[PDB]
Design an enzyme around this catalytic site. Structure first.
Site, PDB file in Angstrom:
ATOM      1  N   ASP B  25       4.659  -7.422  -9.052  1.00 26.68           N
ATOM      2  CA  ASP B  25       5.408  -6.282  -8.540  1.00 26.68           C
ATOM      3  C   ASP B  25       6.587  -6.708  -7.681  1.00 26.68           C
ATOM      4  O   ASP B  25       6.432  -7.009  -6.482  1.00 26.68           O
ATOM      5  CB  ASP B  25       4.484  -5.373  -7.738  1.00 26.68           C
ATOM      6  CG  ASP B  25       5.156  -4.104  -7.307  1.00 26.68           C
ATOM      7  OD1 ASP B  25       6.366  -3.942  -7.586  1.00 26.68           O
ATOM      8  OD2 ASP B  25       4.461  -3.240  -6.748  1.00 26.68           O
ATOM      9  N   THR B  26       7.760  -6.789  -8.300  1.00 22.84           N
ATOM     10  CA  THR B  26       8.932  -7.321  -7.620  1.00 22.84           C
ATOM     11  C   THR B  26       9.448  -6.345  -6.577  1.00 22.84           C
ATOM     12  O   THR B  26      10.273  -6.708  -5.747  1.00 22.84           O
ATOM     13  CB  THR B  26      10.082  -7.644  -8.604  1.00 22.84           C
ATOM     14  OG1 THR B  26      10.421  -6.474  -9.363  1.00 22.84           O
ATOM     15  CG2 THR B  26       9.674  -8.777  -9.544  1.00 22.84           C
ATOM     16  N   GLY B  27       8.978  -5.101  -6.649  1.00 23.43           N
ATOM     17  CA  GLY B  27       9.345  -4.071  -5.673  1.00 23.43           C
ATOM     18  C   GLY B  27       8.465  -4.034  -4.441  1.00 23.43           C
ATOM     19  O   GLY B  27       8.720  -3.250  -3.523  1.00 23.43           O
TER      20      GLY B  27
END
Ligand code: C7J
Ligand code: CL
Ligand code: CL
Ligand code: CL
Lengths: 99, 99
Positions: B25-27
Protein backbone atom coordinates in the site's frame (compact mmCIF):
# COMPACT_ATOMS: atom_id res chain seq x y z
CA UNK A 1 9.51 6.94 -14.39
CA UNK A 2 10.74 5.04 -11.38
CA UNK A 3 9.16 6.53 -8.26
CA UNK A 4 10.90 6.05 -4.92
CA UNK A 5 8.88 5.41 -1.75
CA UNK A 6 11.11 7.28 0.68
CA UNK A 7 8.54 10.06 0.47
CA UNK A 8 4.81 10.01 -0.33
CA UNK A 9 4.41 9.40 -4.06
CA UNK A 10 2.64 12.63 -5.02
CA UNK A 11 1.94 13.60 -8.61
CA UNK A 12 0.07 16.29 -10.51
CA UNK A 13 -3.12 15.24 -12.24
CA UNK A 14 -5.17 17.14 -14.80
CA UNK A 15 -8.91 16.62 -14.36
CA UNK A 16 -12.00 18.61 -15.31
CA UNK A 17 -9.83 21.51 -16.44
CA UNK A 18 -8.14 21.62 -13.04
CA UNK A 19 -4.69 20.66 -11.78
CA UNK A 20 -4.56 18.76 -8.49
CA UNK A 21 -1.96 16.99 -6.36
CA UNK A 22 -2.72 13.34 -5.62
CA UNK A 23 -1.14 10.27 -4.06
CA UNK A 24 -0.27 7.22 -6.18
CA UNK A 25 -2.03 4.68 -4.00
CA UNK A 26 -1.80 0.94 -4.62
CA UNK A 27 -3.96 0.25 -1.55
CA UNK A 28 -6.91 2.18 -3.03
CA UNK A 29 -9.25 0.28 -5.38
CA UNK A 30 -10.79 3.54 -6.59
CA UNK A 31 -9.55 7.09 -7.25
CA UNK A 32 -10.99 9.48 -4.64
CA UNK A 33 -10.72 13.26 -4.83
CA UNK A 34 -11.82 16.13 -2.59
CA UNK A 35 -14.97 18.08 -3.46
CA UNK A 36 -15.01 19.31 -7.04
CA UNK A 37 -17.38 19.63 -9.98
CA UNK A 38 -17.44 17.00 -12.71
CA UNK A 39 -19.77 16.71 -15.72
CA UNK A 40 -22.30 13.98 -16.49
CA UNK A 41 -24.14 11.32 -14.52
CA UNK A 42 -23.19 10.15 -11.04
CA UNK A 43 -24.41 7.73 -8.38
CA UNK A 44 -23.87 7.76 -4.60
CA UNK A 45 -21.43 5.28 -3.05
CA UNK A 46 -19.93 4.48 0.35
CA UNK A 47 -16.22 3.72 0.46
CA UNK A 48 -14.37 2.41 3.46
CA UNK A 49 -10.89 2.89 4.86
CA UNK A 50 -9.08 3.18 8.15
CA UNK A 51 -11.53 5.01 10.39
CA UNK A 52 -14.70 3.87 8.62
CA UNK A 53 -16.67 5.02 5.58
CA UNK A 54 -17.42 8.22 3.69
CA UNK A 55 -20.14 9.03 1.18
CA UNK A 56 -18.93 9.96 -2.30
CA UNK A 57 -20.35 10.70 -5.73
CA UNK A 58 -19.26 8.15 -8.35
CA UNK A 59 -18.54 9.59 -11.81
CA UNK A 60 -17.71 7.19 -14.64
CA UNK A 61 -15.74 7.64 -17.88
CA UNK A 62 -13.83 10.73 -16.74
CA UNK A 63 -10.73 11.75 -18.71
CA UNK A 64 -7.62 12.32 -16.62
CA UNK A 65 -3.95 12.96 -17.29
CA UNK A 66 -1.23 11.73 -14.92
CA UNK A 67 2.43 12.49 -15.68
CA UNK A 68 1.69 13.02 -19.37
CA UNK A 69 -0.28 9.78 -19.45
CA UNK A 70 -3.89 10.07 -20.59
CA UNK A 71 -6.46 7.67 -19.19
CA UNK A 72 -10.18 7.34 -18.60
CA UNK A 73 -12.00 5.91 -15.61
CA UNK A 74 -14.14 6.28 -12.52
CA UNK A 75 -13.56 9.15 -10.12
CA UNK A 76 -15.11 9.25 -6.65
CA UNK A 77 -15.68 12.73 -5.23
CA UNK A 78 -16.24 13.51 -1.55
CA UNK A 79 -14.74 14.40 1.82
CA UNK A 80 -11.46 12.47 1.61
CA UNK A 81 -8.66 13.97 3.70
CA UNK A 82 -6.32 13.51 0.75
CA UNK A 83 -6.57 12.95 -3.00
CA UNK A 84 -5.66 9.42 -4.03
CA UNK A 85 -5.16 7.83 -7.43
CA UNK A 86 -6.41 4.26 -7.11
CA UNK A 87 -5.75 1.06 -9.03
CA UNK A 88 -8.57 1.74 -11.50
CA UNK A 89 -6.43 4.48 -13.05
CA UNK A 90 -2.96 3.20 -12.13
CA UNK A 91 -3.49 0.17 -14.40
CA UNK A 92 -4.24 2.43 -17.35
CA UNK A 93 -0.94 4.29 -17.12
CA UNK A 94 0.88 0.98 -16.82
CA UNK A 95 1.95 1.46 -13.22
CA UNK A 96 3.48 -1.56 -11.44
CA UNK A 97 5.18 -2.34 -8.12
CA UNK A 98 8.73 -3.67 -8.41
CA UNK A 99 11.19 -5.19 -5.97
CA UNK B 1 8.89 -9.43 -8.79
CA UNK B 2 6.77 -7.03 -10.84
CA UNK B 3 3.23 -6.73 -9.55
CA UNK B 4 0.47 -5.26 -11.71
CA UNK B 5 -2.58 -3.60 -10.24
CA UNK B 6 -5.54 -5.17 -12.01
CA UNK B 7 -6.26 -6.91 -8.71
CA UNK B 8 -5.36 -5.92 -5.14
CA UNK B 9 -1.64 -6.37 -4.55
CA UNK B 10 -2.07 -8.94 -1.79
CA UNK B 11 0.99 -10.81 -0.58
CA UNK B 12 1.85 -13.28 2.14
CA UNK B 13 3.79 -11.92 5.10
CA UNK B 14 5.32 -13.73 8.04
CA UNK B 15 5.35 -12.20 11.51
CA UNK B 16 5.80 -13.97 14.86
CA UNK B 17 6.11 -17.28 13.03
CA UNK B 18 2.67 -16.95 11.45
CA UNK B 19 1.59 -16.35 7.85
CA UNK B 20 -0.87 -13.56 7.07
CA UNK B 21 -2.15 -11.79 3.96
CA UNK B 22 -1.43 -8.09 3.54
CA UNK B 23 -1.89 -5.33 0.98
CA UNK B 24 1.14 -3.55 -0.51
CA UNK B 25 0.00 0.00 0.00
CA UNK B 26 1.99 2.93 -1.33
CA UNK B 27 -0.63 5.31 0.07
CA UNK B 28 0.13 4.23 3.64
CA UNK B 29 3.07 5.85 5.47
CA UNK B 30 2.99 3.12 8.09
CA UNK B 31 2.35 -0.61 8.31
CA UNK B 32 -0.80 -1.47 10.22
CA UNK B 33 -2.00 -4.96 11.08
CA UNK B 34 -5.21 -6.35 12.52
CA UNK B 35 -5.30 -7.27 16.21
CA UNK B 36 -2.51 -9.68 17.17
CA UNK B 37 0.10 -10.28 19.87
CA UNK B 38 3.60 -8.86 19.65
CA UNK B 39 6.46 -8.84 22.16
CA UNK B 40 7.80 -6.01 24.29
CA UNK B 41 6.43 -2.58 25.12
CA UNK B 42 4.26 -0.47 22.84
CA UNK B 43 3.64 3.26 22.48
CA UNK B 44 0.46 5.08 21.49
CA UNK B 45 -0.24 6.39 17.99
CA UNK B 46 -3.21 7.86 16.17
CA UNK B 47 -3.35 7.15 12.46
CA UNK B 48 -5.50 8.92 9.93
CA UNK B 49 -7.50 7.25 7.23
CA UNK B 50 -10.24 7.95 4.74
CA UNK B 51 -12.93 7.77 7.43
CA UNK B 52 -11.10 9.48 10.29
CA UNK B 53 -8.53 8.38 12.86
CA UNK B 54 -7.99 5.20 14.85
CA UNK B 55 -5.85 4.43 17.90
CA UNK B 56 -3.18 1.80 17.39
CA UNK B 57 -0.37 0.19 19.36
CA UNK B 58 3.10 0.94 18.02
CA UNK B 59 5.71 -1.82 18.24
CA UNK B 60 9.26 -1.11 17.11
CA UNK B 61 12.04 -3.25 15.64
CA UNK B 62 9.77 -6.19 14.79
CA UNK B 63 11.04 -8.81 12.32
CA UNK B 64 8.62 -9.36 9.42
CA UNK B 65 8.96 -11.20 6.09
CA UNK B 66 7.13 -9.70 3.10
CA UNK B 67 6.97 -11.93 0.02
CA UNK B 68 9.98 -13.74 1.47
CA UNK B 69 11.92 -10.47 1.78
CA UNK B 70 13.31 -9.83 5.28
CA UNK B 71 12.50 -6.56 7.08
CA UNK B 72 12.73 -5.32 10.69
CA UNK B 73 10.75 -2.25 11.65
CA UNK B 74 7.70 -0.59 13.09
CA UNK B 75 4.38 -2.38 13.10
CA UNK B 76 1.15 -0.69 14.20
CA UNK B 77 -1.57 -2.97 15.57
CA UNK B 78 -5.24 -2.00 15.74
CA UNK B 79 -8.71 -2.05 14.24
CA UNK B 80 -7.75 -1.65 10.60
CA UNK B 81 -10.11 -3.09 7.98
CA UNK B 82 -7.21 -4.87 6.27
CA UNK B 83 -3.54 -5.64 6.91
CA UNK B 84 -1.52 -2.97 5.07
CA UNK B 85 2.22 -2.85 4.40
CA UNK B 86 3.16 0.83 4.28
CA UNK B 87 6.15 2.73 2.97
CA UNK B 88 8.17 2.19 6.14
CA UNK B 89 8.55 -1.48 5.16
CA UNK B 90 8.16 -1.16 1.37
CA UNK B 91 11.41 0.81 1.40
CA UNK B 92 13.16 -1.97 3.32
CA UNK B 93 12.34 -4.51 0.60
CA UNK B 94 13.41 -2.16 -2.21
CA UNK B 95 9.97 -1.46 -3.61
CA UNK B 96 9.34 1.22 -6.23
CA UNK B 97 6.49 2.31 -8.50
CA UNK B 98 7.28 2.18 -12.20
CA UNK B 99 5.48 3.23 -15.35
C1 C7J C 1 -5.79 6.67 2.28
C2 C7J C 1 -4.32 6.90 2.63
C3 C7J C 1 -4.10 8.37 2.97
C4 C7J C 1 -3.92 6.03 3.83
N1 C7J C 1 -4.72 4.80 3.88
C5 C7J C 1 -4.09 3.72 3.11
C6 C7J C 1 -4.95 3.42 1.88
O1 C7J C 1 -4.21 2.67 0.91
C7 C7J C 1 -6.24 2.69 2.26
C8 C7J C 1 -5.94 1.27 2.78
C9 C7J C 1 -7.13 0.61 3.09
C10 C7J C 1 -7.52 -0.51 2.36
C11 C7J C 1 -8.73 -1.13 2.65
C12 C7J C 1 -9.52 -0.69 3.70
C13 C7J C 1 -9.07 0.36 4.51
C14 C7J C 1 -7.88 1.01 4.20
N2 C7J C 1 -7.07 2.57 1.06
C15 C7J C 1 -8.30 3.06 0.96
O2 C7J C 1 -8.80 3.71 1.88
O3 C7J C 1 -9.00 2.79 -0.18
C16 C7J C 1 -10.33 3.31 -0.23
C17 C7J C 1 -10.54 3.91 -1.60
O4 C7J C 1 -10.52 2.76 -2.48
C18 C7J C 1 -11.17 1.67 -1.76
O5 C7J C 1 -10.33 0.48 -1.75
C19 C7J C 1 -9.80 0.30 -0.42
C20 C7J C 1 -10.78 0.98 0.51
CL1 C7J C 1 -12.17 -0.09 0.96
C21 C7J C 1 -11.30 2.14 -0.31
S1 C7J C 1 -5.03 4.31 5.40
O6 C7J C 1 -6.00 5.30 6.03
O7 C7J C 1 -5.67 2.92 5.34
C22 C7J C 1 -3.55 4.26 6.34
C23 C7J C 1 -3.08 5.43 6.92
C24 C7J C 1 -1.89 5.43 7.62
C25 C7J C 1 -1.15 4.26 7.74
N3 C7J C 1 -0.01 4.26 8.42
C26 C7J C 1 -1.62 3.08 7.16
C27 C7J C 1 -2.81 3.09 6.43
CL1 CL D 1 -12.74 2.73 -13.77
CL1 CL E 1 -0.46 -4.55 -17.83
CL1 CL F 1 10.15 1.23 10.45
Amino acid sequence: PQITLWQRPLVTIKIGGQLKEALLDTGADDTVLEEMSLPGRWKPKMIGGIGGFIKVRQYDQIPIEICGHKAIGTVLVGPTPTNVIGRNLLTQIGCTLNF
